[PDB]
Design a binder for this molecule. Structure first.
Ligand SMILES: CCCCCCCCCCCCCCCCCC(=O)OC[C@H](CO[C@@H]1O[C@H](CO[C@H]2O[C@H](CO)[C@H](O)[C@H](O)[C@H]2O)[C@H](O)[C@H](O)[C@H]1O)OC(=O)CCCCCCCCCCCCCCCCC
Ligand SMILES: CCCCCCCCCCCCCCCCCC(=O)OC[C@H](CO[C@@H]1O[C@H](CO[C@H]2O[C@H](CO)[C@H](O)[C@H](O)[C@H]2O)[C@H](O)[C@H](O)[C@H]1O)OC(=O)CCCCCCCCCCCCCCCCC
Ligand code: CLA
Ligand code: CLA
Ligand code: CLA
Ligand code: CLA
Ligand code: CLA
Ligand SMILES: CCCCCCCCCCCCCCCCCC(=O)OC[C@H](CO[C@@H]1O[C@H](CO)[C@H](O)[C@H](O)[C@H]1O)OC(=O)CCCCCCCCCCCCCCCCC
Ligand SMILES: CC1=C(/C=C/C(C)=C/C=C/C(C)=C/C=C/C=C(C)/C=C/C=C(C)/C=C/C2=C(C)CCCC2(C)C)C(C)(C)CCC1
Ligand SMILES: CC1=C(/C=C/C(C)=C/C=C/C(C)=C/C=C/C=C(C)/C=C/C=C(C)/C=C/C2=C(C)CCCC2(C)C)C(C)(C)CCC1
Ligand SMILES: CC1=C(/C=C/C(C)=C/C=C/C(C)=C/C=C/C=C(C)/C=C/C=C(C)/C=C/C2=C(C)CCCC2(C)C)C(C)(C)CCC1
Ligand SMILES: [Cl-]
Ligand SMILES: [Cl-]
Ligand SMILES: [Cl-]
Ligand SMILES: [Fe+2]
Lengths: 334, 81, 342, 38, 451, 137
């Protein structure tokens, strides 16, 4: 074998402790750059003029933040969707003021995480597996694309991308509610059904398999020792599990087929989260939640408030207060 | 199986549909009339569109006393003239 | 021994389409009434006298905006029994006073007890360990903390969640503006357990479906499984290698994997419940004191934390007069907090 | 500015070329089963 | 019935169309019948739009997406995009609707009556997915067809009345394109432009000369490529790079359509040339700029000196500099300074927005347009309540730009998913493990332990 | 509460004369106001100039007075600035500028009266909400 042939054999080797592969050739450097920049920025970055109004917001630990308040702050509204790599700045000091780290991080991250998804297909192929784990990962990935790329595109600025920080995330959520009434949007509602249901079914499946473990141990040892890695025989009794759950509800509401059950476990959260991602990605173009403001009117024409109108009052509070020095004109159009 | 007649047997039988082409429409119509006669408003105490406010009133008839709450509502209802 | 008790026990535990049990005597009426009460209220019942809201299909609300709303604040924590001193046996007045709220909450609570007893009862009869019932303690801790303990620590049932889609959304936004509930590490642990549970659900389902053994000739692979088969339907060994190489670690023990799937969302929900118990008393994680001391002295110091409090202050001022009508709030235009232009 | 830019451009080009030529290097054959897919 | 249950086909009902992979006749029917559905919708939707259409309201106030496509081609409209004749819209709708019956007829025939496989019937129409030469030949036919399609657009623009030109001197109007851009430096230059702000890759195309010239190129490229693929068979390196199967080819096309979907989303969101704002409403960037313009005009009429007016932050309230110094509108719309539109451009000088032009040269038609666009911003609820999320019910409006961007993002996204699903499946099926791991030949069991 | 003949009774002119609109005129007025005006005047405010609203008290202090049917109908034909000083048909929808505001092309005299009646009746129903903006939502 020549050098290229050998290199290819190593890259695609099924024997590396962590699989590299061709997607990994892009994933490794991009994820390392994003990680390193993030860590350094989160600790040490100076304040960033997120809203382009010369009002710098401090995100880093050394500049007065704790783990909860800290963030890498989105790039300046003055930049908008302009590409702002380090070399476009006159200095690192300028780059930092304008939120250059945010762009470097999210672009390397999105590239790296897309390659992470490809890499999941890639290894499944090398191991002779079925290929669709990567399709499940497309759900959180799509969600990351929605908040870091698609929303900024629709609104015309990376300053409206989700901040890389715990409190910045909450800021993004509250402002999103004000501007899109996301709670009243059916795609976010499907998302909630996806994650509440995902958690429910996770607990359900956990509890049912755990409930029907076949006795292989004594009381002075963990029942976990009753299963040995790679054993051929199933470790629980699915017939007893189905016997239980089918009586809890009724026979035909319970799965007796493990393949069907596990498919449902994959599908429910993944589809819901795809809708969550699509909610963000379509509210990115301002097709917003249901608006029933003043929908109910009496015989004279008096407005009779519903809970929708109370939501509206909360939303107004968010709207009027957010970015309190950034608006000069009466309508918030992006 | 648990001994009851299969649902698919029942709902593909003529007798089920002889019974239920009567009972289902009967229930639906009874529900309809519960509303269309206005009885629903009376049973539950729900305002009709002309009964949220007196003509010139713009204040909500909020219950403000726990133990005289019944009378308060009755007083609010009287004030609709 | 063959008395009436044992004969009743026999009938209760007959293997039928819908199992009944001793637990059924509690469960079925309470669940039926809770659900029936919700459907009845959302269809026909107003919230005009308690909230100044329309809340039923009858009044023109849709599925998103209908609710059974909490009683007026002036009711305090009254049980609001139909035969109690407020409604005095009058079904109509009882509806107008929010009696259906305590009706649903209380039958709901006893119904949940019945459901968990049902989980125990069936597990015992079938001869399985009662981990499903144990896991259900999380839904119960949430229901009890949010629908009972929270309003009990507040002024009245008025501040419990109203049973409705939009009403629940209002409850979320209230908790943000008033409690800064996103900042609370007990809610944060709840979020991690819910999202972590959804993650585990998806990843485990997908891993099993993608490490299946070929056990049939069909390209649709569901038929190639038999409930009574002894063998694992998928390869733990291949799954383990895949994740070890992709992510760095992997499950190797199926019993541990499935216990963890119980542990994560159950623990999350239990954590969120503890935070809500604090909120019953306004014992919030509202502020970081060091942040406030700095920001008060230094008008150039700004974080996402200070930004979110401005949002909260807007929520409170803008929503309170209509959301809390018993307070009779009148906030002149000039006092309302607003940024420039908006 | 300029040296950094050129350096990153070269780095990115390097890895992209690896990705493309790598997947071009008989990738369908790199599996545990049927290799004759040409 | 051949292959029409799970036992014989290996595919369950919910994967039923996979039963068609190797049945070229029935599969032709599926495809032709489906082309029928697309043509049916195009025709029926147009007639529906026309029946609902009020000529003196803007199209974008009327939930129209198809009439705007016809109007952009220069049919039925005059100066400013005013509707002068609805008959071209009627023709487009009827002719599609009639054509769909024909396609539906052929589809139904092939699907249930005609020969199930075409190979025994005809060597020309029959095909084996694995026959690389036959695959490239059929691909070649379709490329020629597509090239002719692109030249049809060129024909309309140059020889059959022209296209609607929002940029036309003295005001938007239908205009014949006599000098299409042929220079490959300009045409392919778009393809190498950055997709980021102020650049916008192909989405930045801002004049009909470039649009028409692009389609001349694309038409010729597609016809040349088609001939190429009829006359050649895939080279060795291509043979070793791809999976050669029906499902693989589907996956490649799903990937391509996904990409196109996202591009179309950005096209309708930002571009106001091939999506004239007269027909589609203002872009998000456009309406935000139009707001700043509106209040600059208002306050300047009241006596404000808008050049020297300092806002609360220290930046100009109405006017400020971009990061490269160009004079741009201020407030949040600073992000939208790359916006370009016929109503704004007359105020633009070498250095950006010109203060002397602003002070002296703003015409009433500019005020009207800015006010119109500001109050038809592409914001609105799912139930079509126009405006911000806190707005009251009153205006029934969601911009066609929002409808078209959101729908196409959703479609593009699910098509990426379909690409991954089918590409991963095509690989696994080709290698022989799509149904699961062979218990007696589990690959991982022959591999050394990781540790 | 009901939409009574009294609620529907509004000033015809500045000289003390009233007109009682029918329920159908009220409905037509809402519809036509939504069709031609609400894009800028939703809820009684003005989006392109929030300083000027459609409140009755505001219309009364306009020149010429606009707090009556005649004043409003005239506004819709020949709109002026608030002091009556300039004619603004070139930048404001009117019958006189139906050429540049094409939605005004199909409005009849009857339609203008219905729109005028809407503007006067709505605050009698909605109070401060009419012309109040988001504060009163
Ligand atoms: C575990 C999971 C198992 C499954 C759960 C099963 C569900 C069972 C259902 C139980 C329902 C319990 C309802 C209790 C109602 C209540 O409390 O109603 C409240 C009443 C007290 O009434 C309140 O009293 C207040 C203070 O009044 C006092 O002070 C006033 C001001 O000074 C005046 O002086 C006034 O006259 C004086 O009485 C206000 O008046 C309120 O309006 C009024 O509602 O206490 C009482 O009935 C009894 C109080 C003592 C017993 C409480 C035990 C149960 C509750 C535990 C939670 C504690 C909450 C702490 C928050 C953390
Ligand atoms: C095989 C694939 C290879 C991929 C390898 C990776 C290579 C990098 C690709 C770049 C990634 C895109 C980032 C920037 C996207 C963007 O800002 O896109 C916007 C641009 C348009 O840019 C805008 O273009 C505008 C053009 O309009 C101008 O010209 C007009 C002419 O009428 C008007 O006058 C207008 O007013 C005027 O401003 C302006 O320049 C704007 O400033 C500018 O922002 O769209 C475009 O270039 C084209 C659309 C890009 C696609 C959209 C991305 C979506 C992909 C996410 C998929 C999710 C994945 C899920 C995984 C699970
Ligand atoms: C197991 C089923 C079940 C359970 C646990 C409950 C429980 C409840 N109901 Mg529901 N209900 C049920 C079934 C049930 N109900 C059914 C089937 C109906 C249809 C008829 C209803 C209709 C209903 C209505 C309309 C209302 C309730 C209400 C209530 C609450 C108060 C009840 C109370 O105070 O009782 C007190 C009585 C007991 C606890 C029984 C005690 C039995 C003891 C052990 C025997 C002693 C009695 C003795 C012989 C009498 C001698 C007295 C003498 C000195 C005069 C509570 C949550 C109220 C509520 O929800 O308000 C918000 C209410 O208004 N229920
Ligand atoms: C665009 C939608 C579409 C199209 C064009 C097709 C096309 C086809 N499918 Mg698929 N399928 C679809 C969606 C579609 N399918 C969906 C959504 C599902 C899930 C429910 C399926 C599940 C499925 C299964 C399980 C199977 C097919 C099969 C087939 C083929 C044979 C059908 C047959 O034998 O009919 C028999 C039915 C009839 C004779 C009844 C009448 C049907 C005709 C076509 C209706 C025409 C109505 C129309 C209004 C008439 C206009 C005429 C006018 C122009 C003159 C046919 C090529 C079969 C196949 O693969 O065989 C090898 C097969 O087994 N399909
Ligand atoms: C590109 C696709 C597209 C777009 C952008 C539009 C756009 C529009 N249409 Mg048109 N139309 C379409 C396709 C489209 N339509 C189709 C397929 C039909 C046949 C049913 C129609 C028939 C039609 C009629 C009869 C009317 C419109 C009207 C309208 C307008 C209002 C829409 C509305 O209120 O939505 C309401 C929103 C919904 C109903 C929600 C849709 C959500 C879907 C179900 C989610 C899809 C998710 C995904 C694709 C599924 C994947 C699942 C996953 C698990 C794999 C708007 C301009 C109205 C109009 O104004 O005409 C002048 C009108 O009356 N359309
Ligand atoms: C992609 C579309 C397509 C393709 C590849 C085929 C292919 C085939 N057809 Mg089907 N069919 C179609 C669509 C198609 N058909 C449509 C739309 C209809 C309804 C009119 C039919 C109705 C039909 C019937 C009734 C029969 C066939 C038959 C055949 C076979 C022989 C055809 C032949 O000898 O032509 C030789 C060439 C000619 C006769 C001259 C073609 C003249 C064309 C129409 C000129 C216009 C071309 C133009 C570019 C089309 C643009 C359309 C575009 C706008 C959509 C062959 C397998 C026969 C069969 O299968 O035998 C058992 C048969 O009996 N077809
Ligand atoms: C539907 C359109 C279509 C499709 C599906 C094909 C399919 C095929 N072509 Mg054909 N071709 C077409 C149209 C098409 N062609 C046209 C219009 C022309 C005239 C220009 C040609 C001229 C042509 C030639 C000369 C050759 C092919 C070849 C091939 C084969 C391999 C192609 C390949 O490896 O791509 C993958 C692409 C590459 C390996 C190029 C480098 C990839 C870069 C890095 C991607 C950059 C793009 C990126 C996504 C961003 C886009 C913007 C960018 C421009 C900046 C395959 C059968 C080969 C063949 O075997 O001939 C028989 C071959 O030599 N085609
Ligand atoms: C026979 C089957 C028997 C089985 C039934 C068992 C009982 C449980 C059923 C619970 C269903 C609750 C939904 C009621 C909705 C309703 O009636 O709306 C009735 C409303 C009535 O519509 C309203 O009517 C008013 C009349 O004054 C006004 O006209 C309003 O404008 C109008 O919106 O319709 C809607 O809102 C349309 C959407 C309804 C779709 C529901 C959304 C689905 C999400 C539900 C998820 C929960 C899971 C349920 C699974 C089953
Ligand atoms: C309260 C009360 C009571 C009771 C009652 C009851 C019990 C009731 C009931 C009731 C009921 C029991 C009702 C009902 C109902 C219902 C309904 C109303 C429904 C519906 C529905 C729907 C509408 C559906 C739909 C849908 C869905 C959800 C799914 C999917 C799709 C669709 C859309 C199809 C009593 C007397 C004791 C006493 C006092 C009080
Ligand atoms: C295969 C298949 C399928 C499918 C199918 C299809 C897809 C089809 C189609 C189809 C079609 C696609 C069709 C059609 C049609 C059409 C028509 C039938 C037409 C017509 C028309 C007309 C008649 C007209 C008229 C008119 C005029 C002229 C003018 C104006 C008015 C009017 C409108 C009246 C399915 C899924 C079922 C399944 C099984 C198989
Ligand atoms: C019309 C028009 C125009 C033009 C245009 C043009 C001229 C174009 C084009 C175009 C083009 C010219 C394109 C393209 C492309 C391409 C592509 C899209 C590709 C791809 C690829 C791939 C997919 C690959 C793959 C792979 C790899 C990477 C590695 C190994 C393996 C494989 C083979 C798998 C303008 C703008 C002026 C204006 C307006 C209109
Ligand atoms: Cl903010
Ligand atoms: Cl602004
Ligand atoms: Cl005022
Ligand atoms: Fe499992």
């Amino acid at each position: 074998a020549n050098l290229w042939e050998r290199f290819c054999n190593w890259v695609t080797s099924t024997d590396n402790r962590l699989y590299v592969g061709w997607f990994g050739v892009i994933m490794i450097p991009t994820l390392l750059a994003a990680t390193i920049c993030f860590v350094i920025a989160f600790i040490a970055a100076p304040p960033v003029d997120i809203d382009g109004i010369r009002e710098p917001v401090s995100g880093s630990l050394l500049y007065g933040n704790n783990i909860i308040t800290g963030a890498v702050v989105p790039s300046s509204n003055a930049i908008g969707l302009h590409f702002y790599p380090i070399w476009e700045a006159a200095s690192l000091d300028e780059w930092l003021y304008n939120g250059g780290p945010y762009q470097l991080i999210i672009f390397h991250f999105l590239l790296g995480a897309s390659c992470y998804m490809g890499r999941q297909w890639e290894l499944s192929y090398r191991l002779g597996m079925r290929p669709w784990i990567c399709v499940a990962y497309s759900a959180p990935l799509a969600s990351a694309f929605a908040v870091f790329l698609i929303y900024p595109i629709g609104q015309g600025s990376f300053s409206d991308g989700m901040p890389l920080g715990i409190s910045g995330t909450f800021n993004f959520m509250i402002v999103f509610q004000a501007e899109h009434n996301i709670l009243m949007h059916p795609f976010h509602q499907l998302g909630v059904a996806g994650v509440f249901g995902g958690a429910l079914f996770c607990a359900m499946h956990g509890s049912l398999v755990t409930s029907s473990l076949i006795r292989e141990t004594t009381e002075t040892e963990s029942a976990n020792y009753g299963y040995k890695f790679g054993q051929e025989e199933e470790t629980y009794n699915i017939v007893a599990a189905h016997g239980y759950f089918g009586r809890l509800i009724f026979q035909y509401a319970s799965f007796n087929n493990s393949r069907s059950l596990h498919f449902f476990l994959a599908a429910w959260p993944v589809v819901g989260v795809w809708f969550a991602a699509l909610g963000i990605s379509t509210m990115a173009f301002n097709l917003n939640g249901f608006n029933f403001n003043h929908s109910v009117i009496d015989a004279k024409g008096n407005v009779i408030n519903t809970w929708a109108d109370i939501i509206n009052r909360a939303n107004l509070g968010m709207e009027v207060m957010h970015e309190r020095n950034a608006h000069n004109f009466p309508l918030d159009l992006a | 199986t648990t001994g009851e007649r299969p649902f698919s047997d029942i709902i593909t039988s003529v007798r089920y549909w002889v019974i239920h082409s009567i009972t289902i429409p009967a229930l639906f119509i009874a529900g309809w009339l519960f509303v269309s006669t206005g009885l629903a408003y009376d049973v539950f105490g729900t305002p009709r569109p002309d009964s949220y406010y007196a003509q010139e009133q713009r204040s909500i008839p909020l219950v403000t006393d726990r133990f005289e709450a019944k009378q308060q509502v009755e007083t609010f209802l009287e004030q609709l003239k | 021994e063959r008395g009436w008790f044992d004969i009743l026990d026999d009938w209760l535990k007959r293997d039928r389409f819908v199992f009944v049990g001793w637990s059924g005597i509690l469960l079925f009426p309470c669940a039926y009434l809770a659900l029936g009460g919700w459907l009845t209220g959302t269809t026909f019942v107003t919230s005009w006298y308690t909230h100044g809201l329309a809340s039923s299909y009858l009044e023109g609300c849709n599925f998103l905006t209908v609710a059974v709303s909490t009683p007026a604040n002036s009711m305090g924590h009254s049980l609001l029994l139909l035969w109690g001193p407020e409604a005095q046996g009058d079904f109509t007045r009882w509806c107008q006073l929010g009696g259906l709220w305590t009706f649903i909450a209380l039958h709901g609570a006893f119904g949940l007890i019945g459901f968990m007893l049902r989980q125990f009862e069936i597990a015992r009869l079938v001869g399985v360990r009662p981990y499903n019932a144990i896991a259900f303690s999380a839904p119960i801790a949430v229901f009890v903390s949010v629908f009972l303990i929270y309003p009990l620590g507040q002024s009245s049932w008025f501040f419990a969640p109203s049973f409705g889609v939009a009403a629940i959304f209002r409850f979320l936004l209230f908790f943000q503006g008033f409690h800064n509930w996103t900042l609370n590490p007990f809610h944060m642990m709840g979020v991690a357990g819910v999202l972590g549970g959804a993650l585990l659900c998806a990843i485990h389902g997908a891993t099993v479906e993608n490490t299946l053994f070929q056990d049939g000739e069909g390209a649709s692979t569901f038929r190639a499984f038999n409930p009574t088969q002894a063998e694992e339907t998928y390869s733990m060994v291949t799954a383990n290698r895949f994740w070890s190489q992709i992510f760095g670690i992997a499950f190797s023990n199926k019993r541990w994997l499935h216990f963890f799937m119980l542990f994560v969302p159950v623990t999350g929900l239990w954590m969120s419940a503890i935070g809500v118990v604090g909120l019953a008393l306004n014992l919030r994680s509202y502020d970081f004191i060091s942040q406030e001391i700095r920001a008060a002295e230094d008008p150039e110091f700004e974080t996402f934390y200070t930004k979110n409090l401005l949002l909260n202050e807007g929520i409170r001022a803008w929503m309170a007069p209509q959301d809390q009508p018993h307070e009779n709030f009148v906030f002149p235009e000039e006092v309302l907090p607003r940024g420039n232009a908006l | 500015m300029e040296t950094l830019k050129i350096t990153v451009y070269i780095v990115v080009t390097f890895f992209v070329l690896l990705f493309v030529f790598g997947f071009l290097s008989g990738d369908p054959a790199r599996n545990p089963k049927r290799k004759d897919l040409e | 019935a051949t292959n029409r249950d799970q036992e014989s086909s290996g595919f369950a009902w919910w994967a039923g169309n996979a039963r068609l992979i190797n049945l070229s006749g029935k599969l032709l029917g599926a495809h032709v019948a489906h082309a029928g559905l697309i043509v049916f919708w195009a025709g029926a939707m147009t007639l529906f739009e026309l029946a609902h259409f009020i000529p003196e309201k803007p199209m974008y106030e009327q939930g129209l997406i198809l009439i705007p496509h016809i109007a952009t081609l220069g049919w039925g409209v005059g100066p400013g995009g005013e509707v002068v004749d609805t008959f071209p819209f009627f023709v487009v709708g009827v002719v599609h609707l009639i054509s769909s019956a024909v396609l539906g007829f052929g589809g139904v025939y092939h699907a249930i009556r005609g020969p199930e496989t075409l190979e025994e019937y005809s060597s020309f129409f029959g095909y084996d997915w694995k026959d690389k030469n036959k695959m490239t030949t059929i691909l070649g036919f379709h490329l020629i067809v597509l090239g002719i399609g692109a030249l049809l657009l060129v024909a309309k623009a140059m020889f059959f009345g022209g296209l609607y030109d929002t940029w036309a001197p003295g005001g938007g109007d239908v205009r014949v394109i006599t000098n299409p851009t042929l220079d490959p430096r300009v045409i392919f230059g778009y393809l190498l432009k950055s997709p980021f702000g102020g650049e916008g890759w192909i989405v930045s195309v801002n004049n009909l000369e470039d649009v028409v010239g692009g389609h001349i190129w694309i038409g010729l490229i597609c016809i040349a490529g088609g001939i190429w693929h009829i006359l050649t068979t895939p080279f060795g390196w291509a043979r070793r790079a791809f999976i050669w199967s029906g499902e693989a080819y589907l996956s490649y096309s799903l990937g391509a359509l996904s990409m196109m979907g996202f591009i179309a989303t950005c096209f309708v969101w930002f571009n106001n040339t091939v999506y004239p704002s007269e027909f589609y409403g203002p872009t998000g960037p456009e309406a935000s700029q139009a707001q700043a313009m509106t209040f600059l005009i208002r306050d300047q009429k009241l006596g404000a000196n808008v050049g020297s007016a300092q806002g609360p932050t220290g930046l100009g309230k109405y006017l400020m500099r971009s990061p490269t110094g160009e004079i741009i509108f201020g407030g949040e719309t600073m992000r939208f300074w790359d916006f370009r539109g016929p109503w704004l451009e007359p105020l633009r000088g070498p250095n950006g927005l010109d203060l002397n032009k602003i002070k002296n040269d703003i015409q009433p038609w500019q005020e009207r347009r800015a006010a119109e666009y500001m109050t038809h911003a592409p914001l609105g609820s799912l139930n079509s309540v126009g405006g911000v999320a806190t707005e009251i019910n009153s205006v029934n409006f969601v911009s066609p730009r929002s409808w078209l961007a959101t729908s196409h993002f959703v479609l593009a996204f699910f098509f990426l998913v379909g690409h991954l699903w089918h590409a991963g499946r095509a690989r696994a099926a080709a290698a022989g493990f799509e149904k699961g791991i062979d218990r007696e030949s589990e690959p991982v069991l022959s591999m050394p332990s990781l540790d | 509460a009901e939409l009574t003949p009294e609620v529907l009774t509004v000033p015809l002119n500045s000289e003390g004369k009233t007109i009682t609109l029918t329920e159908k005129q009220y409905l037509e007025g809402k519809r036509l106001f939504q069709y031609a005006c609400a894009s800028c005047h939703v809820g009684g405010i003005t989006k392109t100039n929030p300083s000027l609203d459609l409140r009755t008290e505001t219309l009364a202090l306009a020149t010429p007075p606009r707090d009556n049917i005649e004043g409003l109908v005239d506004y819709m034909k020949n709109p002026t600035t608030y002091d009556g000083e300039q004619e603004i048909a070139e930048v404001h929808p009117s019958l006189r500028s139906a050429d540049i505001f094409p939605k005004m092309r199909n409005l009849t005299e009857k339609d203008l009266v219905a729109i005028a009646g809407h503007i006067l009746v709505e605050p009698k129903i909605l109070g401060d909400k009419w012309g109040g903006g988001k504060v009163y939502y």
